[PDB]
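Researcher: Let's try something more involved. This one mixes different molecule types, so please make sure each is placed in the same coordinate frame as the others.
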Amino acid sequence: IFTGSADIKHLLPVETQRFQSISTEFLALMKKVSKSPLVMDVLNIQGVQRSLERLADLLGKIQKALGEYLERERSSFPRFYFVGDEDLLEIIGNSKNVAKLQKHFKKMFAGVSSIILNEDNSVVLGISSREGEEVMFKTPVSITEHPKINEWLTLVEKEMRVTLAKLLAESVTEVEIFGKATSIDPNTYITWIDKYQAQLVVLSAQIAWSENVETALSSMGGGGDAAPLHSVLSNVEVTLNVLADSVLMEQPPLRRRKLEHLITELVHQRDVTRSLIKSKIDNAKSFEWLSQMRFYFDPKQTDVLQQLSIQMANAKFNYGFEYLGVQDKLVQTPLTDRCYLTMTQALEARLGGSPFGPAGTGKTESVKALGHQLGRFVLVFNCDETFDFQAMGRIFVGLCQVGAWGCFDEFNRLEERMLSAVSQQVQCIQEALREHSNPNYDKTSAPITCELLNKQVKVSPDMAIFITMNPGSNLPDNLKKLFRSLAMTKPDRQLIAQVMLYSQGFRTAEVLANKIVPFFKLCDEQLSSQSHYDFGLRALKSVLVSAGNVKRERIQKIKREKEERGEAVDEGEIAENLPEQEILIQSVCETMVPKLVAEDIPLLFSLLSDVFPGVQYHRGEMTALREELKKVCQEMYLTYGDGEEVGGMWVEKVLQLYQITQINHGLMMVGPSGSGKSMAWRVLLKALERLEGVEGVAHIIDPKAISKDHLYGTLDPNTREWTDGLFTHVLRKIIDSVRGELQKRQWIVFDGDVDPEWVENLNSVLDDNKLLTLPNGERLSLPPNVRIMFEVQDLKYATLATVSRCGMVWFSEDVLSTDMIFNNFLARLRSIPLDEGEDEAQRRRKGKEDEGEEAASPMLQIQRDAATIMQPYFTSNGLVTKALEHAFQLEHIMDLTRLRCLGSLFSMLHQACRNVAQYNANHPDFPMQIEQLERYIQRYLVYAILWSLSGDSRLKMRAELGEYIRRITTVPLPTAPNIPIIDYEVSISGEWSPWQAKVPQIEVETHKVAAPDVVVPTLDTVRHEALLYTWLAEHKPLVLCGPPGSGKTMTLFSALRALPDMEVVGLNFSSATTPELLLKTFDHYCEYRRTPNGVVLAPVQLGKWLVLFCDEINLPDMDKYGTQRVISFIRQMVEHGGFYRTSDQTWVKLERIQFVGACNPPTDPGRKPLSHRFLRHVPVVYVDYPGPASLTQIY
Amino acid sequence: IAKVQADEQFGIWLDSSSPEQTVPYLWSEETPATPIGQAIHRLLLIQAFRPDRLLAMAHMFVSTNLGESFMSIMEQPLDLTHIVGTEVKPNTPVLMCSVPGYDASGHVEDLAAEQNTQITSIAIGSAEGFNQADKAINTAVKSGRWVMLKNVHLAPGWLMQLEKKLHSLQPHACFRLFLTMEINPKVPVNLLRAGRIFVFEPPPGVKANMLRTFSSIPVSRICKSPNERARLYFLLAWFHAIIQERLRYAPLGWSKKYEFGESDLRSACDTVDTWLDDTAKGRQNISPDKIPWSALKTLMAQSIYGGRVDNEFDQRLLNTFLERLFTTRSFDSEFKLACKVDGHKDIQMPDGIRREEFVQWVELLPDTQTPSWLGLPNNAERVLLTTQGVDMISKMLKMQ
Amino acid sequence: LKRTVENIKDPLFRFFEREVKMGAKLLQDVRQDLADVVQVCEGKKKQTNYLRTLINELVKGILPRSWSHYTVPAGMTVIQWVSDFSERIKQLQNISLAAASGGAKELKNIHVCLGGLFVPEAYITATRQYVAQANSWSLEELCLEVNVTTSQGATLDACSFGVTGLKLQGATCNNNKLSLSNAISTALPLTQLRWVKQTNTEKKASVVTLPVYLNFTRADLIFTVDFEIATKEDPRSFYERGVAVLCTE
Ligand SMILES: Nc1ncnc2c1ncn2[C@@H]1O[C@H](COP(=O)(O)OP(=O)(O)NP(=O)(O)O)[C@@H](O)[C@H]1O
Ligand SMILES: Nc1ncnc2c1ncn2[C@@H]1O[C@H](COP(=O)(O)OP(=O)(O)OP(=O)(O)O)[C@@H](O)[C@H]1O
Ligand SMILES: Nc1ncnc2c1ncn2[C@@H]1O[C@H](COP(=O)(O)OP(=O)(O)O)[C@@H](O)[C@H]1O
Ligand SMILES: [Mg+2]
Ligand SMILES: [Mg+2]
Ligand SMILES: [Mg+2]
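Model: All components are placed in one shared frame. Result:
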């Protein structure tokens, strides 16, 4: 407290002097203790007990004196009860730096997000909203003349209320002219709307309508002619026509929101006037008029809080004149009318309100809207797990003292202890409120108080408590008799949609509403149960707003086209000759299709056609980006297609991802593994780079390979030393823009599982705030170019908050076709030479078409011939595809994925062409002829198909796949009567040769007879060793799985040690294994070198590849969200080829480092199934028991 | 089957009002059955033919086995005098559980009044209430005094602590602790197990409900000017009864069991007071046309009673009841509170204009209430009965 | 049900597929639990905690909570539940045979017992969309007209669908007109749900809107039916007496 702000010492000089004296004594004592830290030595210090008791007494006195000072400051300015002790100390302590107070005005006030200061921060000229709307004080508050924070802040609040009252008086005086008129000039009306604040505009229009209707009814009481009400309705309709004409035009966002609020108001006013005319009310005291919320403005009243009266039925409140900023007005449906009536009746009866119903029915929104209609400050307390229990008493005292409203989002979500305590507090406050209703009470002196925070807190009559509940349950037994319940169970979505569509300029608002509400019901009940699906009222409102935006952009496009031509321009004419249904369907599709799984798109379009018959959705044409995408896909060997062509779904997915990047700043790709997410966003980044000319940089940050502290940074509590985490370091580097980071498109991709632990700090970044709050206290603003991107497999352990804050693009596995992967493999084989490493790798980028480099190497020619021969088998219905479907039919030791098998097959084919190369090198005189090379490659393709699709399968299923291949192929398979095809090797020549021929007959010495390093070569041993050599030539994370005792560990170790340039490191994994084990292994066996490209982690021994034999891949335990952190680390290091140092926050690229794993079947106890994003890269082989012949040979 | 077809009076029996008292002979046996055998055979026959009468037949079975006066004590009013004096030990709390909305503290208040034993009544729920409770418990245990602890269902953990305190405590011979509750699952099992339990339920019926309503509302409140005020309360009282009794016949009466209770009645009385005071403005008499019928109907249909109602058909039923009762026609001499009652003769609203006249009319109501009073069909009772009958059998399965 | 290219476009097929998918899983669960109970009662299986509590509930008649994955009447015993389950699964087998051998269009001509279905409101939604798709009508311009036909095998129009098992509580439907009845409940022989184009004709004073509740507990509302009042009967009498329609009794 006394070393955080210098002004705290000035506020409390006696206490500062006292603490300085104590601190001196305490530091001397602690030095004495540090000299002799033994507990017996400390206990033997002379008079230590008495000194510590005296220090405890004095320190308690200062802490109390400080608490009393804080309580006095809170009592002087009751709104300070809404900020904590640290925030309050910051507010009063930072008196000179007024600009530090602007971050707390949102907690204290309703719509006041900041205050506008003078040149020298000595005069408060007014207040400002979060949107930007400003209120200029009539008489500015001078801080210099009132230096105390409480004094000038109270003057700011009082001048807020006075200025709002005076501006409302002026606005009402102006709008009475429009009310008493038959033709409102659009320009004058728009000028009036621009002049006054949104809440004052809506309130003035409400006041004018109420006065006009009351005068009309008073006249008809004697006259008996319905002419005055007809005039009122005609005026409302004329003003509504003017508002519609204005809202079709192009308006500033603030004026647009004001127009929408005014339209929502006037629709309700026209409805009420029509009801009054239809029911033939002639008296102003009839309940058909009394039940409507009426506004009686009395400008002559000296007290601003008693100038405007809002009366509904019996109840009669006063406008609190609280600046609400630009709030979201609600469509005044009959359900909301009933809510207003019930809550006002409860408030007049001094009872609280309890709207109950299913979530999303507008309960807390209706409570907040009623509070804002009365000019009150409503605080909504979310009763989820993130509930401030310790602050509840302070906030309750604040509500009682300032006369603010308090709404609980879902009071039944609280746990039993919090529920009971908050119920007791609500009960005492509501009993205090009931004590205001006794007529015998003396109103001259009314100090009604309640027992809050163990003190008598005065309760203002204007405050109220609302308890929104969700049945399935009921109010606590103590609050049942103090609260009036209301069933808000079915919002009138049709009228909400109709009024919002009318406010967006749609002429056929009613038809479109009656179409779009049942359609959203259909989608919510006919689309696959998905967590990211949201067809509620909020989503419907967002869709309607987007449809209005689409309508206005079409209008602007037509207007610009006509301006370019010689044709005249008329906004209303353009709006009339314009399809509203097509715009609504376009908005619905553009909002929902990216989130849809492959099965739900046909369903969505079927339900759509059912509701909108004959209306077709045509996707926007994007020829420039399409051609850039095609060029990038050609460059990256990817497959491109338009519409129904191969790659069409992938291209439409990348276009959807682009539109989501345009709309949102945070977004997710939640397709399954191997569905084209990474290629989609990389190709989009490169296409945008080539199209817009803005450089694109991506920061793939696996959030689970590192801890939360290593991701967001941490500060030492002992020394207050701050460390930047990986994400914070990246964001800070972008913000600083030392090398023009703001001039480059920065995408922060995460590429890891999403859980409600590492995204909590990201919630404010993904929200509209676009701000990262650090435990240090820094507030890092998200730059406009930065795009936070999540590439995930699923959303099983993701919060609805994170899903809602982010755009959604679902990459169903149908997006990526097997033909697309086959084409990619063939193009890469025909283009990229296998033998060439660093050379001819950058030459691919340096050459746009690589003219004159067709014969780059003999390797390239050999693999081009191989691709030519393998082309027939990699067709749409070729051998590989049918074999893959059959393998999908079979059962495997691991969860089968298409890309695991396909990658294993491609690596085996690469090894086949490498074998052709080594044969050519060993026989310069006789190059391997075309016929022999065709035979060998066909046979090796069959071999690779069997060993890649049935590698996980048992011997029976390997035989089944071999028989299926034999049935469905024409290549010459071995003619063995009773020997499996997988028992044969393809030699260099096209002929097969049994594996048993390659098995030698070794002899073991007398000792070491059963040594743990002797491996007797058998058919399985040599076969698996060949597979290891194949898949380790390409440095894949080969995994052998099988029952215990089969020989996985010994075969792996023997084969790895057989390789000369190979350092084998055994890393036994267990449930306690974490990535720090791999980091320790890298520290022990490797070194980091700062190459010009970047940090490279390479083995200390040059010219040798380090293999990390991880003996039990399955064992590492999953989190409570089902994720093995070390497995994710290995996946990152094998996919992205590197990781991130937790000390430097820099990318470290691996060099000459491999991974090999062994497992027991995942069905065994203690073994967890590996993630599909990890299994995609690993080739898994089922090492079954050797069998009678192999056992016979070995033993 | 053969005996059913051959019997001629089977049709008149199956349609009889009380078939259990005249069950005919439809079982074949080698030797004549004992009275309990005939009772069980008639119980089976009633269950097969007229399940609604099963409960009544069940009673007869008990009457044939445990005597005709086995249950006869229960219909008699509870006599707490002897039970508290002898049966209940000083360290055994008397738990007095009422249905939600009902009160049972008045019983022991009158018990202590007639016993001339000092009793201290304490309302539980607040910390000051807890301190008053435990200090009064200590004073009474050391002085042989009676303690009332009202609405102790509000503090379950404090109830557990009280049970633990009573277990070790050794009271005086005249100490008596009464704890009143509204039957909640929150009540500790150990407290219920270690205390005498008394369950209180209100006497069902429109007459009893209206008598309770008139007792709860003060006479002076109903007596305030204008003189029409009393009549309004009568209608309101009637309305309250008509809905609460209808709650017994759910789901046919109300689609679900709403918590229409004292809170709604107080809110409706307050609404009537406010609106009638606004309309009358001090006049001693106002015309029946001047009463804000629309205001009362709307506030009771959407705010007072309609707040709990979430079904649209239940809201429609509530609106129909309110539009039928609260009109100017209710101030006529021939207004019919309930039509087609029992299929013949209909309830007429009392002609009087004073509170005592309305209470007298309530007290002279015939003790022959049928669901036709509530607007329900007269067979609704039968449905209720058969449900209860099935329910009994289900409970009898759970005791197996 | 065997999902094909043409069958997936049928809303009725999709509904029936979801229904049978739920029913088969519930069938397997209940049958396995009963087999375990039989094994324990035969003496060859040890009473585990789940087995012990299941046996206790079956002996006491309490409906197991692991069972009843669909909407069921509250407080209902195990015997009623297994009887209703047998009837529902028999209906599901009939609809499965109709879908496999009778063709997709037969699903339009088959009479469906709303009580047997787990989600009959989804069936009513499907029927509406079917009519809309066949007649190229927009979905929201369709309103439901109910025609009670006492004739056996009454002809079904293109937009008229047959529904059986409907019970009328406290009323009798003669010539598609309701009369107040002192009977406990009457059974509607065959209800033709006909999805007609909505018309702005004012609803008559002799027309009553009756809720079609899922079961006798009146806890789930499926839809509403507009019926015609017969003779001089006030609709307020229908409202007060609690007249309604039940999918199952
Ligand atoms: N080809 C072989 N030559 C020699 N011994 C073999 C051979 N195959 C299996 N064995 C024996 O079988 C056992 C295999 O041990 P090991 O290689 O540790 O099995 P594993 O597959 O790693 N089983 P686990 O780690 O328990 O899941 C040893 O006792 C070996 O001696
Ligand atoms: N447009 C394309 N044309 C051809 N092949 C493609 C295309 N997109 C992707 N592929 C192939 O499919 C593979 C998987 O694609 P990608 O790496 O984008 O998957 P992902 O969705 O990010 O999966 P994971 O969850 O494993 O990270 C690529 O490595 C490539 O071989
Ligand atoms: N009368 C209305 N006009 C406009 N929108 C409404 C109306 N009623 C409800 N909504 C919308 O319905 C959603 C319900 O959200 P909210 O009320 O916060 O949750 P709950 O309904 O569970 O309390 C809100 O997003 C709100 O925009
Ligand atoms: Mg909500
Ligand atoms: Mg990826
Ligand atoms: Mg091993």
